[PDB]
Amino acid sequence: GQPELYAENSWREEMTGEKGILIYPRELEVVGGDDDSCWLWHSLILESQGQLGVEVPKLMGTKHVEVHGRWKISDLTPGLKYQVLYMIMVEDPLEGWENCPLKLRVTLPDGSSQTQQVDLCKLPKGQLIMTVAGYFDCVGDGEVIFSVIETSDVVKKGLVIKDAVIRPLPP
Amino acid sequence: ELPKVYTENTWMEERNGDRGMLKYPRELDITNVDDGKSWVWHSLVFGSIGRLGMEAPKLMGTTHVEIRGDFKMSKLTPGLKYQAVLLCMKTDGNEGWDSCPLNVELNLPDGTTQKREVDLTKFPTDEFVMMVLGYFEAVESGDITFSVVDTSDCVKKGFVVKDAALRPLPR
């Protein structure tokens, strides 16, 4: 079980060819990600399979939650509508999130922004959760930037980021 | 060695509770996968920094390709429309696919069966494809099974399985 196989973190829809992207959190920009009192990095396990091959950060107690991803719009399939997702999980101990929803944001090269909010206190703990950060049309150039943010004046813990996903909405 | 985050092989959409599920290759039934010759287990490495692998099988040379899996309807969202997929990759150096299509079947609890033949020469090389096993609307109970099979005389090479998934239609 030793030979390694390196592969691009992407997929193509079979019938129509559109490209989707997965971004693992080691390739995101995690503010304080190198500080174990802020984020502590874990191996993601599924007991019946073994390691899933993803190092995931768990929030350990910081007031400043800021995670950014980015992708070249021109690297995706032209003319399609795309959706940006963040796959997350909450786990005990959870703290600091009451009335401070996690903010998800997509910003486009024209400067426009879409923000969603997720109340972490209402999520079932341990479940992998698909959250929608926003939508964009694959036209033009530049980078789409997709973030999760909570910077209120309160220590937070218990959030795990599994990955970000940029997926096409094909016919 | 990293601390662990344990998962279940399902996910749920934050916005409405809709559920998906998936199975990784050690949870699939792959004929002869441990024979040391037909398939070889690789460490499948996605990402470029902080890389961990997942154990995944690569087809090394056999005439007998038989991949099967099953899912519980009760783990899905009743009434929701699903797409069943196999995330797989045709690799550089593949052989035998010119005259041997994969026969794909998705079997639903109501006794119905969806069949198709997949021409792997039309897949891109060295990128994962979401191969479509079928489409259905979930009900309360029952077993979903699928098979991807070819046992023809042609010696087949160069095919990696990542996972099988039942996902809500992307929207």
Q: 3-state SS of A3-67?
A: CEEEECCEEEECCCCCEEEEECHHHCEECCCCCCCCEEEEEEEECCCEEEEEEEEEECCECCEEE
Number of Cβ within 10 Å of residue B85's Cβ equals: 22
The secondary element (H helix, E strand) that includes residue B45 is strand B39-46
Report d(CA A131, CA A88) in Å as an integer. Answer: 8
Distance of CA A104 to the CA centre of its chain: 9
Q: Position of tokens 């795990």?
A: A160
Among residues B63, B61, B67, the alpha carbon closest in space to that of B40 is found at: B61
Q: Position of tokens 């087949």?
A: B156
Angle B112-B28-B6 from CA coordinates, rounded to 5°: 120
Q: Position of tokens 């795309």?
A: A82
Amino acid identity for residue B73 in this structure: M
Instruction: State whether B170 and A14 contact (CB < 8 Å).
Output: no
Among residues B2, B110, B89, B72, the alpha carbon closest in space to that of A25 is found at: B2
Distance of CA B154 to the CA centre of its chain: 22
| Burial of residue B170 (number of CB atoms within 10 Å: 0-12, 13-18, 19+) | middle
Pairing label, strands B128-137, A10-13:
parallel
Q: Where are the domains of chain B?
A: 13-168
Contact present, A83 and A59 (Cβ < 8 Å):
no
Report d(CA A102, CA A124) in Å as an integer. Answer: 15
CATH number for the region B13-168 comes to: 2.60.120.260
In this complex, the residue of B6, B49, B52 whose CB is nearest that of residue A53 is B52
Pick the CATH number of A16-168 from 3.30.70.100, 2.60.120.260, 3.40.50.970, 1.10.760.10: 2.60.120.260
Report d(CA A110, CA B141) in Å as an integer. Answer: 48
**Token pair for A106:** 């997509």
Q: Which residues of B touch A24 (CB under 8 A)?
A: 46-47, 50
Instruction: State whether B53 and A27 contact (CB < 8 Å).
Output: no
Query: In the PDB record, what is the listed experimental method?
Result: X-ray
**Token pair for B122:** 């039309």
Instruction: State whether B11 and A12 contact (CB < 8 Å).
Output: no
Instruction: State whether B42 and A1 contact (CB < 8 Å).
Output: yes
In this complex, the residue of B13, B41, B50 whose CB is nearest that of residue A130 is B13
Q: Where are the domains of chain A?
A: 16-168
Q: Which of A52, A58, A81 to mutate to test binding with chain B, by most B CBs within 10 Å of its CB?
A: A52
Amino acid identity for residue A55 in this structure: E
Q: Position of tokens 């971004």?
A: A23
Report d(CA B130, CA B84) in Å as an integer. Answer: 9
Record the resolution, in angstroms: 2.0
Pairing label, strands A50-59, A39-46:
antiparallel
Amino acid identity for residue A118 in this structure: V
Contact present, B100 and B150 (Cβ < 8 Å):
yes
Report d(CA A163, CA A148) in Å as an integer. Answer: 11
Instruction: State whether B54 and A13 contact (CB < 8 Å).
Output: no
Angle B87-B24-A7 from CA coordinates, rounded to 5°: 50
Report d(CA A38, CA A155) in Å as an integer. Answer: 10
Sign of the torsion angle spanned by Cα atoms B5, A128, B48, A12: positive
E-strand ranges in B52-142 read 53-59, 65-72, 81-95, 102-107, 113-118, 128-137
In this complex, the residue of A46, A53, A124 whose CB is nearest that of residue B9 is A46
Compute CA distances B57 → B8, B36, B122, B123, B161, whole Å.
Answer: 21, 11, 21, 18, 6
Is B44 within 8 Å of chain A by CB?
A: yes
**Token pair for B61:** 């040379």
Query: How far A171 CA lies from chain B's nearest CA (Å)?
Result: 10
Angle A13-B157-B147 from CA coordinates, rounded to 5°: 55
Angle A141-A142-A143 from CA coordinates, rounded to 5°: 135
Contact present, A66 and A158 (Cβ < 8 Å):
no
Q: Which of A60, A90, A102, A130 to mutate to test binding with chain B, by most B CBs within 10 Å of its CB?
A: A130
Pairing label, strands A29-30, B4-6:
unpaired
A127: phi then psi, degrees, rounded to nearest 5 = -85, 140
Q: Position of tokens 């997709």?
A: A146
